Design a protein around this ligand. Structure first.
Ligand SMILES: CSc1nc2cc(Cl)c(Oc3cccc(Cl)c3Cl)cc2[nH]1
Ligand SMILES: CSc1nc2cc(Cl)c(Oc3cccc(Cl)c3Cl)cc2[nH]1
Lengths: 115, 115, 115, 115
């Protein structure tokens, strides 16, 4: 699994469950083409977005739909979504974990890159 | 000053100086049109982006060029840029402060909305 | 002002007001002796904790009563308090700003050390 | 496993490996008694600190030795250590995961509490 996302909720002290996210890849004409999408499980994890063959070099954007997550819980948050934009596989294949911690007016994201 | 941005460097424990950013407003056709831009000062702050008359309700995107910042320090970063995407909503007098804390593989952002 | 603390609320997107904290200095027998204390202002800031003459090199602990803050908002928090423990070291003129961003089950803290 | 700790490094984009930590529990005389200790594995995780029987109600402090971690990597950080202080098992047994993200001048911690 070369691209996985883990999301935690800092208000409830729990995984962030049912968070939708869309992944895009920058096309040669510099537009964002849809690449993969999914939602976090009961563990706050989203696996199986892509494969080693399909996950070629490029610039990728992970849009985490944090607004829909908070609204579904009856909370009005600040951000529309959280964005994680990065060049992937520039030096050969890597495995990426994107971790996110969500509050209504704040979020943090970090990346774990392994070879 | 209805919109200010402050950027901090978590590696050096200092304001992030000379960090360029652009602010976009979402248009009716869902494109991002330029709205304002600048570079952070020696205090890591960027003031004077817009005025109350101009800063109407809408969806705004702040795109922070974190990659050039790390590159100029000789450090290889993960992210192409940091994005902060939010709705401005009229609810009493509201000043927006967007803060971003930068590390090579991570960033945190929070909003302080005051009266 | 060689030592200032700023506290933000990530649930409400606001300064954390009336947050009490104590600062301790480590003594030669490894106990923590009281050094300074106060409560954050309406801007979430606590100034005037110490002076340059008094703020000598040493290990300092800032103990922030985050639990009382959340309790007064009707929210059950995880942490008993937030601690920031650091060494003050003379390297040019150095002002210390300690920032803490509070959520019920999380906190982030950073230091900005300027000249 | 009722108490586990996961630590990530925001500078290297990796688990934080070989981070030492000491856990203390507040005794009836209000002193901190040593409870458990360990170091994070290659995955940045520390398991096996305690057992369900031994992990009774109380106030616990997890001291994460972030200074030794950064120094061992030749970096001079701000904090002496990161502290996580919390009441555990007040409403019956729970499982706690403490997650931490480390930068030289900043850290974030969050808690995941499951039943
Ligand atoms: C893939 S299993 C897993 N490892 C984790 C490591 C950490 Cl640090 C974590 O918390 C965070 C995740 C993102 C930003 C911050 Cl600021 C924090 Cl604190 C959750 C984690 N979940
Ligand atoms: C209301 S104006 C304001 N000044 C600030 C100074 C600091 Cl250092 C601050 O910290 C942070 C900024 C971003 C992420 C994190 Cl994780 C933290 Cl901790 C927030 C601030 N907001």
């Amino acid at each position: 699994c070369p691209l996985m996302v883990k999301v935690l909720d800092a208000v409830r002290g729990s995984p962030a469950i049912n968070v939708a996210m869309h992944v895009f890849r920058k096309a040669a004409d510099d537009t964002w083409e849809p690449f993969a999408s999914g939602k976090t499980s009961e563990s706050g994890e989203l696996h199986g977005l892509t494969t080693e063959e399909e996950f070629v070099e490029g610039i990728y954007k992970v849009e985490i739909d944090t607004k829909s997550y908070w609204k579904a819980l009856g909370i009005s948050p600040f951000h529309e979504h959280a964005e994680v934009v990065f060049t992937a596989n520039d030096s050969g294949p890597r495995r990426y974990t994107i971790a996110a911690l969500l509050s209504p007016y704040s979020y943090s994201t970090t990346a774990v890159v392994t070879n």
